[PDB]
């Protein structure tokens, strides 16, 4: 999903 | 001599790591205590995920990076976080003990700790082999910084959609590192080279992490002691 | 006075219990420390995530667990696992701080610490009220154990297939525990009764503590910070 | 998928 990656690629 | 905007990339780039590379590793005493099966899985996992956090800080500050698809940034991310944390751990690296020295002797690092964290010598051979040729290179902090966004800008990486657009961004600073070999650094004739060869050097131990990183995290027992970032970075399931 | 097979079933409990209870509390070292957005969320998350492995250890040895199926036996540990660990947790709560103990002072938990793992008082009032009641009844070490193993064994859960099998294995323990507090409790003539309604607090703590969980869980910057067994077990993804 | 609580629960 790469979810946390997405949050901390804001 | 060197442009400004050639300048201007080195000065972001170095503000970039300083930004996030923490000199007093005050940090590591929140991870989970290292232990000398597997007892030093624990500690350097979280070591591992506090690195990624870095690095994806690290790469949201390289000029370009910030304008590439999610999808691209994670496809860089994910494919060259390993290698880009070797190379930010030989700032630790001593050529006498052949060892990471972080602060104290609890988080001090030999090859032994991390066969305790299921990695074979197939691995830290050629690691610790690649951590002293490095060590060896000299590098001002400024070739340093550039080697590791050069190395996060590769656009030939599994997932990379527009490898036109981030071909052109580490060409950019391909160059650039190169202009400051050629202006500010004395005796360095075929440094540059050097460098690029150890670019590749990365390739394969990053290669040999996967293979190995992949027999642990197929064995729940051990994948258990992950973190969500290590198995989302790590992961396959892209 | 008691059966030889419901004594038996006593020993079992009790000697399971010891087994997966550590009154010297010297693995809460290996967890990440403590700090007093979210501080506490790593330490207590690596406490929930041990707490969870002692669970699943006590469960397979509940006379009947081990040969429901696999299914069952996950639809019973992640519906009552943090009932289970509130009932565990009481052991070391002590009714003049109001606080849990486990060994050092770096280990004693407050309200306070709770609501620095992303927790509101809307969960801990009734949470330290439930302590506070359960410690009062001054259980002895067969009834708390008993107690617990009765939760674990509530066929009335989400996702439970053979709840005749299961509603039997608990009505079996309800009378072990029921003939124990009539021979060997004094002044206990209404304790199975306050017991019993022991259990149906924990079921509202543990709908309250799911809410509170699920808002925590849908943050990646919260989610991260958990283990990959307590994301398991107090997920959804079943 | 719970292959954590499988393996543990062998
Ligand atoms: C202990 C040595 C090392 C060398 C690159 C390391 C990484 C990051 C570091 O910090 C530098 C920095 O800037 N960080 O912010 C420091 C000083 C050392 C390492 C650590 C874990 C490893 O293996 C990890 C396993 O593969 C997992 C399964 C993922 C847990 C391997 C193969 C090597
Ligand atoms: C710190 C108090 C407490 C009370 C039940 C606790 C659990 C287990 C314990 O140990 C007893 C034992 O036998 N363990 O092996 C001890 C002494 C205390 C708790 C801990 C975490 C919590 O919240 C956790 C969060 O909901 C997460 C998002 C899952 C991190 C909540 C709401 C309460």
Request: proline share 4%.
């Amino acid at each position: 999903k790469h979810k946390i990656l997405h949050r901390l690629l804001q | 001599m060197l442009s400004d905007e050639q300048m201007q990339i080195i000065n972001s780039l170095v503000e970039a790591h300083h930004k996030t590379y923490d000199d007093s590793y005050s940090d590591f005493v929140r991870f989970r205590p290292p232990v000398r099966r597997l007892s030093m899985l624990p500690h350097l996992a979280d070591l591992v995920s506090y690195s990624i956090q870095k690095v994806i800080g690290f790469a949201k500050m390289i000029p370009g990076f910030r304008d590439l698809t999610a999808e691209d940034q994670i496809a860089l991310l994910k494919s060259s976080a390993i290698e880009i944390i070797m190379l930010r751990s030989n700032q630790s690296f001593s050529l006498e003990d052949m060892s990471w020295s972080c602060g104290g002797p609890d988080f001090k690092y030999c090859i032994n700790d991390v066969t305790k964290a299921g990695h074979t010598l197939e691995l830290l051979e050629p690691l610790v082999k690649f951590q002293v040729g490095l060590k060896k290179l000299k590098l001002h902090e400024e070739e340093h910084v550039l080697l590791m966004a050069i190395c996060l800008l590769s656009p030939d990486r599994p997932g990379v959609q527009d490898h036109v657009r981030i071909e052109a961004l580490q060409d950019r600073l391909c160059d650039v590192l190169q202009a400051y070999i050629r202006i500010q650094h004395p005796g360095g004739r075929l440094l540059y080279a050097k460098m690029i060869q150890k670019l590749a050097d990365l390739r394969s131990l990053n290669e040999e992490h996967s293979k190995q990183y992949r027999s642990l995290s197929f064995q729940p027992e051990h994948s258990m002691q992950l973190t969500p970032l290590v198995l989302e970075v790590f992961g396959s399931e892209v």
